[PDB]
Each structure stands twice: as C-alpha cells, then as structure tokens.
Amino acid sequence: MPTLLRVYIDGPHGMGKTTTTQLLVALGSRDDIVYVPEPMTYWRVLGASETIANIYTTQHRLDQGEISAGDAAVVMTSAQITMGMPYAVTDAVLAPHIGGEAGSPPPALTLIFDRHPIAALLCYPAARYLMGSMTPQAVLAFVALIPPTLPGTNIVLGALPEDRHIDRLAKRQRPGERLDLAMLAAIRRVYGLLANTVRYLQCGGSWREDWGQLSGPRPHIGDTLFTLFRAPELLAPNGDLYNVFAWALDVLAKRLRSMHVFILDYDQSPAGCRDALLQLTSGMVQTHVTTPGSIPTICDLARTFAREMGEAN
Amino acid sequence: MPTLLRVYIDGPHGMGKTTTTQLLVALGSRDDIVYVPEPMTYWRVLGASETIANIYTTQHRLDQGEISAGDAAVVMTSAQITMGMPYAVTDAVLAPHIGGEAGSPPPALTLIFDRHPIAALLCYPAARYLMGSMTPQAVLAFVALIPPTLPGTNIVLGALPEDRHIDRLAKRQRPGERLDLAMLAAIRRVYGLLANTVRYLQCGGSWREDWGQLSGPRPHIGDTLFTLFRAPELLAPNGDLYNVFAWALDVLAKRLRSMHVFILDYDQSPAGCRDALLQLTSGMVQTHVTTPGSIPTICDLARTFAREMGEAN
Ligand SMILES: Nc1ncnc2c1ncn2[C@@H]1O[C@H](COP(=O)(O)OP(=O)(O)O)[C@@H](O)[C@H]1O
Ligand SMILES: Nc1ncnc2c1ncn2[C@@H]1O[C@H](COP(=O)(O)OP(=O)(O)O)[C@@H](O)[C@H]1O
Ligand SMILES: Cc1cn([C@H]2C[C@H](O)[C@@H](COP(=O)(O)O)O2)c(=O)[nH]c1=O
Ligand SMILES: Cc1cn([C@H]2C[C@H](O)[C@@H](COP(=O)(O)O)O2)c(=O)[nH]c1=O
Known part of the structure; x- marks a missing residue:
C-alpha cells in the first residue's frame, strides 16, 4: 500500500509562495516529488484573454465610478470561474485515486500544488x-460548488x-496587475478568517449555534468567515438567513472541517522558507491510493498540467 | 433499512413539466411523496433581480447587434451561476444521506424534483x-463543477x-421571457444529445476512443454531447483538445455514466402524462439512507426549500 502526500501552498498573492516552492522542488529529489504550478497560461490565453488584467482593470473602473457595482460583479464572477476552472477539473480527476488517510513512512510520491x-x-x-x-449571493454560489474535501x-x-x-x-508586478493595497488588505483578512474557521470548526464549533453572537487559539464566530455573511441581502425579514444561504454556510463548514492547515512564516530568507516548508512537510497527513496504477497516473496528470498550463518552472 | 426514491423531471422549458408534476403530487398520497418546485423566487428576487429577464434580454440585444458576444457571454455565465445555485446547494446537503442503491419494495419517501x-x-x-x-471554455468550467452523481x-x-x-x-410565457424559437431548438437538441450520451456511455462508450470519428439504440459519438466540443478554441495546434479540456470531458463522462434516464411522452393529455409518470416511477431505482433520522431530515429540507423558493404549488 503506497502512500501519496499532497501539499497545497496558498495564501495572499505576492508573498513568496512561487519562489519558496520552486526552491523546494529545486532540490532535485527525484520523481518522488512533483510541483504543480499556477495555470497562468489558462488564465491568460486558453480560458479567456488576459483574465488577471480583466480583474484589475474592472476593479479600477469601478473605483473611478466608470461602471456600476452591478457590472463589476458580473465581470468579476465570470473572471473567477475562469481562474478556478483548472483547479476544479484537476481535483475532480484526482478524486478517484485518493484513499483514506494513513497517519502522517515515506510517501511514494509528493505533490506540491x-x-x-x-x-x-x-x-x-x-x-x-x-x-x-x-x-x-455570488460568493455563496461559489461556496455551494466547492468540491468535497478529499482526504x-x-x-x-x-x-x-x-x-x-x-x-x-x-517588486513582483504580474502582467496586467495593478498595485492595489486595498485588495491586498482584503485578501490578507480573508485568508486569516479562513485559518480561524478551520480551527473554530475543529474545536467543535457550530456556526448555527453561535450565529446570534454576531447580531449584538480559541477563535469565536466573529473571527471566522461566517461574519462576512451577515449581509442585509442574505437576511430574511425575521433577521435570520434565508435557508438557501444557511445551507450554503453548512456546506462551507463541511468543506473546511476536514482540512489540515499549516502556517508557514515567510518573514525570512527564501532558503529559510524552503527549509521550513520542507520541515513542515514531515508532519503532514498522507493517504493511500485506490489502485496500484494510481501513483503513475497521478504523476502523469501533474506533469501534463504543469507542462501545458505552467507559464514556467 | 428504509428506502428513498428521487425522481428529477427535466428537459426543455414549456413542455408541461410543471403541469404534470403538480398533477402527480395532487393525488394527495400522504407524506410519502414531496414535490420540490423550481426556485423561481431565488431567480427573481433572492439571488439577483429578474434573472430570467436578464437572460432573454441579453440574448436579444446580442441578436440585434447591440452588444458583443463577449459581453453576452459574461452576463450569461453570471446568470447561469444564479440559476443553478439552489440546485447545487440542495444536492450538496442531501449527499450525506444517500446510501447505496436498493434495486428498484415501497420507498419510505419519494421526492419529485x-x-x-x-x-x-x-x-x-x-x-x-x-x-x-x-x-x-465557460460551458466546460461548469461541467468541471458538476457535483458527483449520487446513487x-x-x-x-x-x-x-x-x-x-x-x-x-x-401559451406559457413566464415573467421577462421572450419567445425564441431558436433557443427552443437549441435546448431541444442539447437534451436529446444528453440522453444519447448516457446511453452511449452505458453501452461501453469511451469518448477518447471515438474522438477521431468526429474529425473526418446504438448511439455513436457524433450523436452525443461530445460533438459540441470540437470547437477551435479548445483544439491545440496538433488538432487535439488541450488536456484541461480533455479532462473536463472525462469528468462529464464520469458524471453522466451513473444516471438513470427515463423518457416521458408529453404528447398526450395532462392526466395521461401524470399517469405515465406515475407508472414510470415503479421501475426507478431506490436507495438506502445513511441514518434513521435521514428520512425526516430530507423531508424537512424539501418542504423548507419549496416553501421559501417556490413561486407556488
Ligand atoms: N524570502 C523572501 N524574502 C523576500 N522576498 C522574497 C522571498 N521569497 C520570495 N520573494 C519575492 O517577493 C516577490 C513575490 O514573490 P512570489 O514568490 O513571486 O510571490 P507569490 O507569493 O505571489 O507566489 C518576488 O519578487 C520574489 O523575489
Ligand atoms: N398534456 C398537456 N397538453 C397540453 N398542454 C399542456 C399539457 N401539460 C401542460 N400543458 C401546458 O403547456 C404550457 C406549459 O406547461 P408547463 O407545465 O407550465 O411547462 P414546463 O414544461 O415549462 O414546466 C402551459 O400553458 C400548460 O397549460
Ligand atoms: C487564484 C486567484 C489569483 N488572483 C490574482 C492574484 C494575483 O494578482 C494573481 C496571481 O497571484 P499570485 O501572485 O499568488 O501568483 O492572480 C485572482 O485575482 N483571483 C484568483 O482566484
Ligand atoms: C434551469 C434554467 C431555466 N432557464 C429558463 C428556461 C425558461 O424560460 C425558464 C423557466 O423554465 P421552465 O419553463 O422549464 O420552468 O428558465 C434558463 O434560462 N436557464 C436555466 O438554467
């Protein structure tokens, strides 16, 4: 029974994530470790034209009063569907090979996403x-479509x-990207709330139980993503969320509950970050694959994806 | 071990689907049968304003050359995300209660969606x-997000x-809906191709194996939804689909393969249709629920959904 190890490096953009992972895989540690890069090419060419630019341009026009929130929202929703398509399809074809967790024993293959x-x-x-x-309502439409969390x-x-x-x-200014310190602050807050949510849920938190507290290491509901959904548009006349929206939040909880989040401190040398990531890896959960041919297949998928959609390595 | 029976009435709009299901549930056959209506209210008010009108208006403007395909596409993608949100979240909260199939034995509860x-x-x-x-590319982004097919x-x-x-x-002209015989023909063709796809796949069809036939009761690849994806935008220089798109098609197959499609002839009296549907029901596959409390829960969800989002019954 060979084990697979999957690690997803995430968080706000422009933090050194691309740099640190490239160093991690730069150790040339044979085939037992494949790095899956951002589908930059899908975003810029295959899925639509210069999607990143479309996003930053759209927010700007809205900030300058050149378009309405309505028009911004419509373009943004469409852009985000394009951003995540390659992530969703990959996770979807990878699901049939992921078996139950096998503790924390060298994994036959490691995937750094x-x-x-x-x-x-x-x-x-x-x-x-x-x-x-x-x-x-759009954010929740996305939430309701988050694929089931794999082991x-x-x-x-x-x-x-x-x-x-x-x-x-x-320093790092991508193609068609505009410096927006507001967006930076917003993304930094979202990711922080996310981490607090996983924790909150794993400590036996039940959003339905704490919801009223909003009205007015132990995170409370007010430090989780659930706060963002006390929006007036979502609230029914009786001051409670419409059931559709309540269910979406249920799905959100079901999805985040089973994730293993790890915090990497990027406040150090790139090499140092690489080391800390490598170190952190030792304590990550592995899983069994459903077929003997799974490991080779999974390795091929990842290689193909990187080759076809990676702007580079 | 109580069994549940789920029936999904689908197909092109304006065919008598709403009429025939209402008659079916109009038999007042107690609690063993709950009808889940279209989330008309979510579409018109809760999710966004008059989404159906937005769709028909948008296609029209495009047909009159008042907007570009690009702008049409962006609004349409956003509108469709709103249309399916309540369907996705329901299926998502219902998944944890659906157990394996139990043949074709009266089901404790029946759900007519x-x-x-x-x-x-x-x-x-x-x-x-x-x-x-x-x-x-957008259609496939949706395909990649289709939730796993439940038993x-x-x-x-x-x-x-x-x-x-x-x-x-x-006769039936909904709020903000415009008669479009072209759209009618297109939707009629899509649903036909869908039925042919389920059949094709169940008879051991493998799209990757038949793909070349496209280049140039036993349906061939050319009679399935796969034909729609020979689009130039999807084809790589070597005349083959980019892997991202090929994978999406893989997911499409995985999703449709396990569905049980039944064809109801609406070319008859509404009562007659109701009878035929009722009759057809006898041969449908049932499933077991994962918990004893599942049946009551599932019944509550369905009742709540219908009450909160049904324009009516
Ligand atoms: N340890 C580090 N210290 C300082 N700058 C770093 C470090 N690691 C990466 N960087 C950088 O900061 C910028 C953004 O890094 P990058 O890895 O490209 O970002 P991202 O987090 O978006 O993937 C780059 O110019 C790169 O030089
Ligand atoms: N058996 C039938 N014969 C003729 N017209 C029917 C029949 N069943 C329903 N209809 C109708 O045709 C129109 C569309 O039906 P409806 O059930 O509302 O459509 P949909 O398929 O979109 O759910 C309605 O005006 C209704 O009267
Ligand atoms: C994943 C993702 C990235 N982005 C932006 C953030 C960055 O400006 C850019 C690339 O991110 P990166 O710096 O982390 O590589 O893409 C989105 O706007 N939406 C998304 O969904
Ligand atoms: C489900 C769905 C319906 N529709 C339209 C078709 C009809 O004009 C209208 C209601 O459909 P209906 O007649 O089947 O009830 O909604 C869409 O445009 N997109 C969708 O995804």
Whole structure:
C-alpha cells in the first residue's frame, strides 16, 4: 500500500509562495516529488484573454465610478470561474485515486500544488465582495460548488507582516496587475478568517449555534468567515438567513472541517522558507491510493498540467 | 433499512413539466411523496433581480447587434451561476444521506424534483453556447463543477414533437421571457444529445476512443454531447483538445455514466402524462439512507426549500 502526500501552498498573492516552492522542488529529489504550478497560461490565453488584467482593470473602473457595482460583479464572477476552472477539473480527476488517510513512512510520491481550489472558489471571490465588486449571493454560489474535501488535504497558508508584504508585492508586478493595497488588505483578512474557521470548526464549533453572537487559539464566530455573511441581502425579514444561504454556510463548514492547515512564516530568507516548508512537510497527513496504477497516473496528470498550463518552472 | 426514491423531471422549458408534476403530487398520497418546485423566487428576487429577464434580454440585444458576444457571454455565465445555485446547494446537503442503491419494495419517501442540477450547470449553458452567448471554455468550467452523481439519480426527460411544443411554449410565457424559437431548438437538441450520451456511455462508450470519428439504440459519438466540443478554441495546434479540456470531458463522462434516464411522452393529455409518470416511477431505482433520522431530515429540507423558493404549488 503506497502512500501519496499532497501539499497545497496558498495564501495572499505576492508573498513568496512561487519562489519558496520552486526552491523546494529545486532540490532535485527525484520523481518522488512533483510541483504543480499556477495555470497562468489558462488564465491568460486558453480560458479567456488576459483574465488577471480583466480583474484589475474592472476593479479600477469601478473605483473611478466608470461602471456600476452591478457590472463589476458580473465581470468579476465570470473572471473567477475562469481562474478556478483548472483547479476544479484537476481535483475532480484526482478524486478517484485518493484513499483514506494513513497517519502522517515515506510517501511514494509528493505533490506540491501552487494554490488549492478554494483560492478561486472562495478566497478571492470573498475578498472582491469586500471590495464591492462581487455580491454575497455570488460568493455563496461559489461556496455551494466547492468540491468535497478529499482526504489528505494539507493546506499551507502563509504569515508575513503587512509592511514586508507590500514591499514584496511592489517588486513582483504580474502582467496586467495593478498595485492595489486595498485588495491586498482584503485578501490578507480573508485568508486569516479562513485559518480561524478551520480551527473554530475543529474545536467543535457550530456556526448555527453561535450565529446570534454576531447580531449584538480559541477563535469565536466573529473571527471566522461566517461574519462576512451577515449581509442585509442574505437576511430574511425575521433577521435570520434565508435557508438557501444557511445551507450554503453548512456546506462551507463541511468543506473546511476536514482540512489540515499549516502556517508557514515567510518573514525570512527564501532558503529559510524552503527549509521550513520542507520541515513542515514531515508532519503532514498522507493517504493511500485506490489502485496500484494510481501513483503513475497521478504523476502523469501533474506533469501534463504543469507542462501545458505552467507559464514556467 | 428504509428506502428513498428521487425522481428529477427535466428537459426543455414549456413542455408541461410543471403541469404534470403538480398533477402527480395532487393525488394527495400522504407524506410519502414531496414535490420540490423550481426556485423561481431565488431567480427573481433572492439571488439577483429578474434573472430570467436578464437572460432573454441579453440574448436579444446580442441578436440585434447591440452588444458583443463577449459581453453576452459574461452576463450569461453570471446568470447561469444564479440559476443553478439552489440546485447545487440542495444536492450538496442531501449527499450525506444517500446510501447505496436498493434495486428498484415501497420507498419510505419519494421526492419529485423540478429539474436536476445539470439543467443549469450543463444543459442551458451548452444551449447558450450554440446561441453564441456563451463560450465553450465557460460551458466546460461548469461541467468541471458538476457535483458527483449520487446513487439513485433517476432523471425523467421529455418527448414532444416540435410543433406541439411550440404551441405549448406560446401559451406559457413566464415573467421577462421572450419567445425564441431558436433557443427552443437549441435546448431541444442539447437534451436529446444528453440522453444519447448516457446511453452511449452505458453501452461501453469511451469518448477518447471515438474522438477521431468526429474529425473526418446504438448511439455513436457524433450523436452525443461530445460533438459540441470540437470547437477551435479548445483544439491545440496538433488538432487535439488541450488536456484541461480533455479532462473536463472525462469528468462529464464520469458524471453522466451513473444516471438513470427515463423518457416521458408529453404528447398526450395532462392526466395521461401524470399517469405515465406515475407508472414510470415503479421501475426507478431506490436507495438506502445513511441514518434513521435521514428520512425526516430530507423531508424537512424539501418542504423548507419549496416553501421559501417556490413561486407556488
Ligand atoms: N524570502 C523572501 N524574502 C523576500 N522576498 C522574497 C522571498 N521569497 C520570495 N520573494 C519575492 O517577493 C516577490 C513575490 O514573490 P512570489 O514568490 O513571486 O510571490 P507569490 O507569493 O505571489 O507566489 C518576488 O519578487 C520574489 O523575489
Ligand atoms: N398534456 C398537456 N397538453 C397540453 N398542454 C399542456 C399539457 N401539460 C401542460 N400543458 C401546458 O403547456 C404550457 C406549459 O406547461 P408547463 O407545465 O407550465 O411547462 P414546463 O414544461 O415549462 O414546466 C402551459 O400553458 C400548460 O397549460
Ligand atoms: C487564484 C486567484 C489569483 N488572483 C490574482 C492574484 C494575483 O494578482 C494573481 C496571481 O497571484 P499570485 O501572485 O499568488 O501568483 O492572480 C485572482 O485575482 N483571483 C484568483 O482566484
Ligand atoms: C434551469 C434554467 C431555466 N432557464 C429558463 C428556461 C425558461 O424560460 C425558464 C423557466 O423554465 P421552465 O419553463 O422549464 O420552468 O428558465 C434558463 O434560462 N436557464 C436555466 O438554467
């Protein structure tokens, strides 16, 4: 019974995630470790034209009063569907090979993913909602479509002080990307709330039970993603969420509950980050594969994906 | 071990689906049968404003050259996400209660759904793609997000001659809906291809194996939904689909393979249709529930959904 190890490096953009993972896989540790990069090519060419630029341009026009929140929201929703498509399809074809968790024993193969489907289906949409370019109903429409959490989903979020983050973000300016410190703050808050949510849920938290507290290491409901959904549009006349929206939140809980989040401190040398990531890896949960041919298949998928959609390695 | 029976009435709009199901449940056959209506209220108010009107207006403007395919596509994608949200969240909270299939023995509860998630996540998006208001990349982004097919998914599609269909469609004109015989033809073709796809796959069809035939009761690849994806935008320089798109098609197959489709002939009296549906029901696959409290819960969900989102019964 060979084991597989999957690690998802996520968190706000411009933090050193791409740099640190490339160093991690740069150790040339044979085939037992494959890195899956961001589908930059899908975003810029295959899925639609310059989607990242479309996003930043759209937020800007909205900020300058050149378009309405309505038009911003519609373009943003469509852009986010394009951003997460390759993440969703990969997770979807990978599901049939993931078996139960096998504790924490060298894994036959290790996959280092650059971001998890939730970045495009939950984290960015939620952040844009805070920026006024997305509606709460849309964010929840994405939440309701988050694929079931597979066993062994180890997500590595990041930690870096705002000032040191801004500096890094200022250096790395992607194609069609515009510096937006507001968006940066919004995304930083969303990811923090996410981490608090996993914790909150794992400590026996039940959002339905704590909801009233909102009205007015132990996170409370007010420090979780659930706060973002006290929006007036979602509240029924009796001051309670419409059931459709309540169910979506139920699904959100079901999805985040079974994830293993790890916090990597990016406030150090790139090599140092690589080491800490490598170290952190030892404590991550592994899983068994459903077929003997699964390992080779999974390795091929990852290689193909990287080759066809990676802007580079 | 109590069994549950789930029936999804789907197919092109304006065929008598709403009429026939209401008659079916109008028999007052106690609690053993609950009807889940279309979330008309979510579409018109809760999710966004007059979404159906938004769709028909948008296609029209595009047909009159008042907007570009690009702008049509963006609004349409966003509208479809709103259309299917309540379908997706319901299926998502219902999943934890559905156990394995129990043959074809009176079911403790029967659920008659008005449409299946695939109508909003696959069928309409594909039809709009044919109408020029949606891109193939977007349709596949929806395909990749279709939730895993639960056991006991009995889908009842419809059969009605075009002329008799048009007449019915001409009578029933929903709020903000515009008569579009082109859209009608496109949706009729999509649903037909769908039925052929389930059949094709169940007879041991493998799209990857038959793909080349496209280049140039036993359906061939050319009579299935796979034909719609020979779009130039999806084809790589070597004349083959980009892997991302090929995988999406893989997921499409995995999803449709395990569905039980039944064809109901609407070319008859409403009572007659009700009888035929009722009759057809006897041969549908049932399933076991995962907990004893599942039946009551499932019954409550359905009742709540209908009450909160049904424009009426
Ligand atoms: N340990 C580090 N210290 C300082 N800057 C770093 C460090 N690691 C990466 N960077 C960088 O900061 C910028 C953003 O890094 P990158 O890895 O590309 O971001 P992202 O988190 O978005 O994947 C790059 O210019 C890169 O030089
Ligand atoms: N058996 C039938 N014969 C003729 N017309 C019918 C029949 N059943 C329903 N209709 C109708 O045709 C129109 C559309 O029916 P409806 O059930 O509302 O459509 P849908 O398929 O979209 O749910 C309605 O005006 C209704 O009267
Ligand atoms: C995943 C994702 C990234 N982005 C943006 C953030 C960055 O500006 C850009 C690339 O992110 P990165 O710096 O982490 O590689 O893509 C979105 O706008 N939406 C998304 O869903
Ligand atoms: C489910 C669905 C319906 N529709 C339209 C078809 C009809 O005009 C209208 C209601 O459909 P109905 O007649 O079947 O009840 O909604 C979409 O445009 N997209 C969808 O995803």
